[PDB]
Design a binder for these strands. Structure first.
Ligand code: K
Ligand code: MG
Ligand code: MG
Ligand code: MG
Ligand code: MG
Ligand code: MG
Ligand code: MG
Ligand code: MG
Ligand code: MG
Ligand code: MG
Lengths: 41, 236, 152, 181, 93, 46, 26, 205, 124
RNA sequence: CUCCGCAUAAGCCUGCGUCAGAUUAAAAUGAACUGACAAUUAACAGCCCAAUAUCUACAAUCAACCAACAAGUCAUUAUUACCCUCACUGUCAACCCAACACAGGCAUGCUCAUAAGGAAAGGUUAAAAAAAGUAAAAGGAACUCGGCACCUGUUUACCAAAAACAUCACCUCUAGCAUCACCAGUAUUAGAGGCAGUUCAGCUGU
RNA sequence: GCUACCUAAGAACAGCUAAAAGAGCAAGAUUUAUAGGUAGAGGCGACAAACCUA
RNA sequence: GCUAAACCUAGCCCCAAACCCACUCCACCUUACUACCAGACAACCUUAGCCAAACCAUUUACCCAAAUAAAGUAUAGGCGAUA
């Protein structure tokens, strides 16, 4: 049995929804967003 | 190049030898290209409202052939039937009921009716019938390929109709929405007498030269003059 | 013959004979200008010029003065969709010179006039297409896009 | 003459040239050897003419008139070879009982494979033939392992094909349940 | 990207097909059949994995022992290498 | 001063060095052919 | 193609929300 | 001969035609169409037979079969199960609208009894003489296999032999006298070829 | 750099290679001193073409022809039609004896024949 | 402008011929890319030869004279055997091995400056910096790591120096012998070792 | 098929002092085409411990 | 709004069961895929190092015919590792 994540899109959107109002690539690139969002929180 | 000769002339100039194809199957046609014997509408017919015997005899010969394939056929009933087919066909234009329209009109008529109005809005209504429609002519084709015999009946219709055509943006481009106007039309109806499921369908209209010019369009038009290359000089 | 073992010949043995030769040849139009007495053929790889002279004289009763051959390389440049070379086959070309001052000219096997005499064999589909195209009229500029079907 | 390479001048330019059926093996089997020998050259001249026309059509970048004529002629000549070969084959069996016209023998090659080796004609006996003796019709022990790998490669391919066929059958039943039988 | 834009074909499982309907039948062949047969005899599968369980090293050792002589050359070579690899891994070498 | 031009093509050398007859000449060369046959090489040798 | 249904169904509901916002029904 | 790639999709256009080449180029790799397997013996539809459509736009109508594509279990019924398309269209010209049939699967089509025109099921059976005929499941009647023009296009009745066509009398004529001699031996005797030199033995290996 | 995949032919290689390799044509002679080629008439294949005058068979057959079942010839069928009648008559007359198989066309050996069935020594 | 060019060999293998193209080079004529069609024709060249024995001391160099040393590509007869003929293959190109600014490599014949073969500038402007070239007052290396003008052979470097190695000669060492090296040689032989120009004057954008 | 050395049978080298022939300026311990040989515990090396298709 | 995104098949894997393969014609060990001349060359001989001993120097493994058990027992071993 091979298992692959199929809902990764929703996992990323949880971060990105908090970064929409950010400036630049932080607002859409997950790897950049997450770090800024963590600092915001 | 659009023409086939130019295509095959280009194909011989390209060495693209296209072999032809022979198959048992062939394209199955439910109608014909044009009128079997054009019925010239006598000039002045609109004004009113031995040759005649010879022309009437031809209709009597043809009506016999139609009776042979379908015995329960009355030419007297056809004018009422043709009027209903004509009205139903045009009503399909109002709501773009193409599949229903295909039953009422032949594949020759269908493109003419619907092609120009693909992105337009048509509002058409049959207000009244000024005088009863009568079968001016009845013709029947000789045996054709696939044993297909067709019968064509021309019906003269003088009726009061209303037509308003809007453009793609909802703006009126032709006609008036409610004003009734008088129209005299000669409508040819065709039926595949051989086909066990053929039915009388609108085929084409006859436009006599004496016909009065149609309603003028609302918008102005510019017909451009000759577009000449620098060397070429304009000549009146 | 080709793709057949030849009986080995020993000094003083019988003549080698081929009763049903499987050699098939094509008479071809020269690509370039040739002398009047020269005829060009495409023959199989195994057919020698001696074979061709006997082949033409024996089967076609054509007196042959001289025969010369050459091996035309077929292009191997073309590649298919898999980027694999496609080989145009090599073929042998023969040049035959007719004896007794005879001359040959390659005939016109596709006469343009005789090819298109406008003979009448009406096709049901073709007539309908051409007929409807004649009925087709250019849109009247003055109508300016208004549908012409409606009598009104 | 040279005009035999070309079709009847009347036919030149015609879109089609009506022709009869190809000779069948049974029709040819009734004919004598002398008749078949004459029919061969009758067919041969027709084949050369069609081959000539086929090439000129390419040179003129036009379709060949009635291309099926060449298919028919090739069919008849193939049938004629079969009919004549059968007569020679049957005669050889009666007089010698030999299945094949050309002598040969089953041999092992240097790669360990078993091959049917067709014999060639020679003027000297094989033991004196310098070139023939250089050929090795035997395999040494080092070939044994490669033979096993080749056999296992064959088995793997066969196993995959059989497994695939059974899988396709299950896909067929899934789409068409009535086919359960 | 990465997520299908349409629903996959609906899954229709026949819970009462013959295989499911009769699953488990005769699992008590011994207890209810005078122990003439043991339940493990019902097990279908590789000859070396019938009524027997083990870790990957034990399975590889067992497979080589029972069918090693019948294995294909390349498969047997891989099995021998695997056992040696697993022998070091499982023994903390 | 030239670089990467080690290859000086010679058909005689290529056939003699890597040819079919050369490979069959020794047992090691025959095994070379056998390996390529097993792998399914389109060209067993030059 | 990843096997599974829950993620595809959830994304379908996501797309329907956008289809509503893009064209708010009357 | 044509070397059709595996899983080649058979369509309305015959393999090798201009339309087929544009539709199915050599690189194309489409999912195979899963076709119910029907043996040649079990196939009960032929060109020319009247059949009734059981599904589609015009179900319950009857028409003759104009083409059979066995690879897809398809029957084309002339004038039925049709849509509309343009033929001859160019950029300048709209083209001519015609009705075009869509293929129907064998299950979607049912044969009609000869005596009564109604959909029926048939089972292959042997006649008293031995001929194989189709017999209806209900009220069994032989369904004569339709008569259809030969694919080659030759009508025997109108056939006239050409200048290169052998006559019936000449082809049927039997000139073969079986004997223990090869074509080479007979032909040399017939042609009076004289060869007195013996063939020297050669070694075969 | 050399092209391994392409077919090896006499066009490739140096002058020695190109001369030695041919295109499959059968030799009709030998080379003598001075590279002089001697052509042996017997080696040259002689085409045996018959007289086609007054010959009724043509390239094609008329389509109005009774189709017949295909029955490939066999050794037994040839024996029953070419050899059985003579033996049957002799057996009734008692003249037949095994020792005289050659009378009916049996060939004990192929040696000494111009056209030998096995090994075949004649061209098609 | 010519730096070459033409041909052969080797390599390469249809790779700027025709037609067509919607493909391509900076270039929507060209086309070396795609599709179709055509093509290089033997006299040049390759591909050779019956046996057995036997014969073959005298270089080449204008080969003559005068010379040599490292001692040399060039030859038969006897007897037997043999009556036959012109097959087969190479023949095209703007081309190969490379490098990806010809960076470069590439045998032979002929031409010795071309009768053959080619184009350094896409257009403009005329900043700096940078590269190459040319000219330069007065001075003429000043100020700068340092300008310019026991034999022989390879090596890094180059004007080169230096060292290293090789090597003539020299020296010791081992070896009395033949049918695969040494050697078809024999201690005057063979092999293995060692071998211990400045200043000045002159010129230069240094 | 690079390179080192070697084998077979080839090829090339203007003028100038020019006795002496010699990397004198500009015919040799020269250069070079072809085929072959020596293979990694190795080969080859006027020996850089270099080179033997990076 | 572009670029794109999305897909379900091709086949494949592991088992089971069964011991597989291959002479149309022609060509192919010489420079393979080359119609056609006095051959003569002939195969057989411990696997090694090393996973580890935290180095390494004896020392450990890859086969020989019944799952299980006897048994990780007897026994071997720088009596160490380990077998
Ligand atoms: K090339
Ligand atoms: Mg030639
Ligand atoms: Mg010559
Ligand atoms: Mg040339
Ligand atoms: Mg010039
Ligand atoms: Mg320029
Ligand atoms: Mg510029
Ligand atoms: Mg100055
Ligand atoms: Mg100073
Ligand atoms: Mg000074």
């Amino acid at each position: 049995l091979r298992n692959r994540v199929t809902d990764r899109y929703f996992r990323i959107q949880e971060v990105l929804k908090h970064a929409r109002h950010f400036r630049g690539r932080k607002n859409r690139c997950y790897r950049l967003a997450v770090r800024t969002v963590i600092r915001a929180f | 190049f659009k023409t086939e000769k130019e295509f095959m002339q280009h194909a011989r100039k390209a060495g693209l030898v296209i072999p032809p194809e022979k198959s048992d199957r062939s394209i199955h046609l439910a109608c014909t290209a044009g009128i079997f014997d054009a019925y010239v509408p006598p000039e002045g017919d609109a004004r009113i409202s031995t040759e005649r015997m010879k022309k009437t005899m031809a209709s009597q010969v043809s009506i016999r052939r139609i009776k042979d394939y379908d015995a329960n056929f009355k030419i007297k009933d056809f004018p009422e039937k043709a009027k209903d087919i004509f009205i139903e066909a045009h009503l399909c234009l109002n709501n773009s009921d193409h599949d229903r329209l295909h039953t009422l009109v032949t594949e020759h008529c269908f493109p003419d009716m619907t092609w120009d109005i693909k992105y337009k809005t048509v509002r058409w209504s049959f207000v009244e019938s000024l005088e009863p429609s009568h079968v001016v002519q009845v013709r029947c084709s000789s045996m054709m390929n696939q044993g297909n015999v067709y019968g064509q009946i021309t019906v003269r219709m003088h009726t009061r109709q209303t037509l308003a055509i809007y453009d793609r943006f909802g703006r009126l481009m032709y006609g008036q929405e409610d004003v009734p106007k008088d129209v005299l039309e000669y409508v040819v109806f065709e039926k595949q007498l051989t086909n066990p499921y053929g039915s009388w369908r609108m085929h084409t209209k006859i436009v006599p030269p004496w016909a009065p010019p149609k309603q003028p369009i609302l918008k102005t038009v510019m017909i451009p003059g000759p577009q000449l290359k620098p060397e070429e000089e304009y000549e009146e | 013959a080709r793709n057949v073992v030849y009986p080995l010949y020993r000094l003083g043995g019988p003549q080698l004979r081929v009763f049903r030769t499987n050699f098939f040849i094509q008479l071809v139009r020269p690509g370039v200008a040739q002398p009047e007495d020269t005829v060009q053929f495409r023959i199989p790889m195994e057919m020698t010029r001696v074979d061709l002279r006997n082949y033409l004289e024996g089967i076609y009763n054509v007196p042959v003065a001289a025969v010369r051959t050459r091996v035309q390389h077929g292009s191997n440049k073309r590649r298919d969709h898999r980027n694999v070379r496609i080989k145009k086959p090599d073929y042998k070309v023969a040049y035959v010179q007719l004896a007794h001052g005879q001359t040959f000219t390659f005939p016109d096997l596709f006469p343009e006039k005789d090819e298109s005499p406008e003979g009448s064999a009406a096709d049901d589909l073709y007539s309908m297409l051409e007929e409807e195209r004649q009925q087709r009229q250019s849109s009247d500029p003055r109508r300016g896009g208004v549908p012409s079907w409606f009598g009104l | 003459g040279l005009e035999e390479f070309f079709d009847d001048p009347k036919n030149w330019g015609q879109e089609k040239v009506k022709s009869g059926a190809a000779w069948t093996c049974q029709q040819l089997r009734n004919k004598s050897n002398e008749d078949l020998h004459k029919l061969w050259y009758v067919l041969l001249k027709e084949r050369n003419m069609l081959l000539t026309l086929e090439q000129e059509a390419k040179r003129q970048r036009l379709p060949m008139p009635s291309p099926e004529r060449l298919d028919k002629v090739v069919d008849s000549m193939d049938a004629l070879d079969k009919v004549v070969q059968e007569r020679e084959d049957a005669l050889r069996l009666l007089q010698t009982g030999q299945e094949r016209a050309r002598p040969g023998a089953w041999r092992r090659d240097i790669f360990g494979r078993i091959i049917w080796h067709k014999f060639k004609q020679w003027v000297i006996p094989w033991h004196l033939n310098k070139r023939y003796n250089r050929k090795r019709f035997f395999a040494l022990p080092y070939v044994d392992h490669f033979l096993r790998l080749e056999r296992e490669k064959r088995a793997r391919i066969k196993a995959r094909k059989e497994n695939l066929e059974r899988k396709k059958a299950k896909i067929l039943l899934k789409k068409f349940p009535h086919l359960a039988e | 990207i990465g997520i299908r834009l349409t629903l996959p074909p609906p899954k229709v499982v026949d819970r009462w097909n013959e295989k499911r309907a009769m699953f488990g039948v005769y699992d008590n062949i011994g207890i209810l059949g005078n122990f003439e047969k043991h339940p493990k005899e019902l097990i279908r599968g590789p000859i070396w994995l019938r009524g027997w369980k083990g870790n990957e090293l034990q399975r590889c050792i067992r497979k080589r022992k029972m069918v090693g002589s019948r294995m294909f050359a390349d498969d047997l070579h891989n099995l021998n290498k695997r056992i040696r690899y697993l022998y070091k891994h499982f023994n903390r070498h | 001063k030239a670089r990467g031009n080690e290859y000086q093509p010679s058909n005689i050398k290529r056939k003699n060095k890597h040819g079919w007859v050369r490979r069959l000449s020794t047992p090691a060369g025959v095994q070379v052919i056998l390996r390529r046959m097993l792998k399914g090489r389109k060209s067993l040798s030059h | 193609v990843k096997k599974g249904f829950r993620a595809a169904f959830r994304f379908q509901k996501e797309l329907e929300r956008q289809r509503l916002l893009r064209c708010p029904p009357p | 001969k044509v070397t059709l790639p595996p899983h080649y999709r058979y369509g309305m256009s015959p393999p090798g035609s201009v339309a087929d080449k544009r539709k199915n180029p050599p690189w194309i790799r489409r999912r195979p169409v899963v076709v119910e397997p029907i043996s040649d013996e079990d196939w009960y539809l032929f060109c020319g037979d009247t059949v009734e459509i059981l599904e589609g736009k015009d179900a319950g109508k009857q028409g003759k079969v104009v083409q059979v594509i066995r690879q897809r279990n398809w029957v084309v019924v002339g004038g039925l199960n049709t849509h509309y398309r343009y033929i001859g269209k160019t950029m300048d010209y709209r083209g001519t609208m015609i009705p075009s049939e869509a293929p129907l699967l064998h299950r979607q089509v049912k044969l009609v009894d000869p005596m009564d025109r109604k959909p029926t099921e048939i089972e292959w059976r042997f006649t008293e003489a031995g001929e194989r005929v189709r017999v209806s499941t209900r009220s069994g009647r032989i369904i004569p296999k339709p008569e259809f023009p030969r694919a080659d296009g030759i009508v025997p009745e109108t056939w006239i032999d050409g200048p290169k066509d052998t006559s019936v009398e000449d082809a049927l004529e039997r000139t073969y006298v079986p004997c223990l001699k090869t074509l080479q031996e007979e032909v040399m005797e017939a042609m009076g070829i004289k060869e007195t030199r013996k063939y020297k033995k050669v070694y075969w290996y | 750099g050399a092209d391994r995949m392409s077919k090896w032919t006499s066009k490739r290689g140096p002058r020695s290679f190109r001369g030695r390799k041919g295109r499959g044509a059968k030799g009709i002679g030998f080379l003598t001193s001075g590279w002089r080629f001697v052509q042996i008439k017997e080696m040259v294949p002689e085409f045996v073409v018959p007289d086609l005058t007054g010959f009724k068979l043509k390239p094609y057959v008329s389509y109005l022809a009774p189709e017949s079942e295909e029955t490939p010839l066999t050794a037994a069928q040839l024996f029953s039609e070419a050899v059985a009648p003579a033996i049957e008559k002799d057996f009734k007359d008692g003249t037949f004896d095994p020792d005289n198989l050659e009378k009916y066309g049996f060939e004990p050996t192929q040696e000494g024949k111009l056209f030998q069935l096995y090994p075949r020594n004649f061209l098609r």
